[PDB]
Amino acid sequence: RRKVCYYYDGDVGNYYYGQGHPMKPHRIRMTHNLLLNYGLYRKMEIYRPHKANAEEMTKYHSDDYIKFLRSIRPDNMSEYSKQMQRFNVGEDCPVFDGLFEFCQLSTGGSVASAVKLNKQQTDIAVNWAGGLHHAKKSEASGFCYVNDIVLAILELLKYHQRVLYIDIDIHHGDGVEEAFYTTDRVMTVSFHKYGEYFPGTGDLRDIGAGKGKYYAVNYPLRDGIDDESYEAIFKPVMSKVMEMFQPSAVVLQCGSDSLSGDRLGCFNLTIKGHAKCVEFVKSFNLPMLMLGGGGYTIRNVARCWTYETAVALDTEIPNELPYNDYFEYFGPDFKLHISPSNMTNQNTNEYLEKIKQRLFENLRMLPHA
């Protein structure tokens, strides 16, 4: 049974994005705490990630974008406003006390784990703080400041010829896509809502460019997708992907805003369905790096990643939530699982099979025997 490494820094739950802001880092602390009380903590190798310095963040980002982040504060907020606009820091990506500390922990977790995978001293490595996939080389976007994912992947390329990147998050993983848009060594597959939704990118025809053409897979979706519909379009596509792209290390971003009843999301997935993807990936027995991502009904974010951690340990846990410091957060029910809503699935079988086929064609264009 696969060996799992879990990365966590106690401080991460305590950093705060701002009044009225949906991204709430505290959800990782909630997970952490459930893991301890579900007895899972016990069963995996627990690491505190040292802070990632500007040194390794600039391995992808601008020497003067990170410089800006290292420097900016809420003190000198009116002094910098020039650079604030050039870098996207505001309306939905606030400045906030500790921001750079927050980035260092998220990035440290992902990088340390990548190394751990390259050093071949784990099979799976988990960092729920990480997964922040909207970030760009020279600007912040969609609550993401540093793209820990890219940096993580860049380290893996040192030992792995082909790195597969899978993205479940309801929002299209455009940061990780754009960063690797012109390379054939990394294939970016993404399943997301599309049409009057952020980030506006990742439609059927977004295939890549140059050497990276036919290496950026996307599955655009409308509202209300079931576990059943999602499963029936994830497994086929990913089996082909493995078949064709034949990777040697997987990085699964396990965005939890694709769950039902999310604050920002509008999909109808249950923890069970959501996790079935993690389990399917894990089954392909490749060095795997689970990251988190979005999720804005934190009670369920907690539930999800707690469950999905169990999946990486292939151990069973009861629906009965164990007592914990935040036990009272979990409704009148205090259960682990969520059920789907009456919400209407506007992804007709006809619409999913059209897209599926188009992708199967795209994937066939890769070399094989």
Partner: peptide, 5 residues
């Protein structure tokens, strides 16, 4: 914005 603050 970016998403929905």
């Amino acid at each position: 914005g970016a998403x929905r603050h």
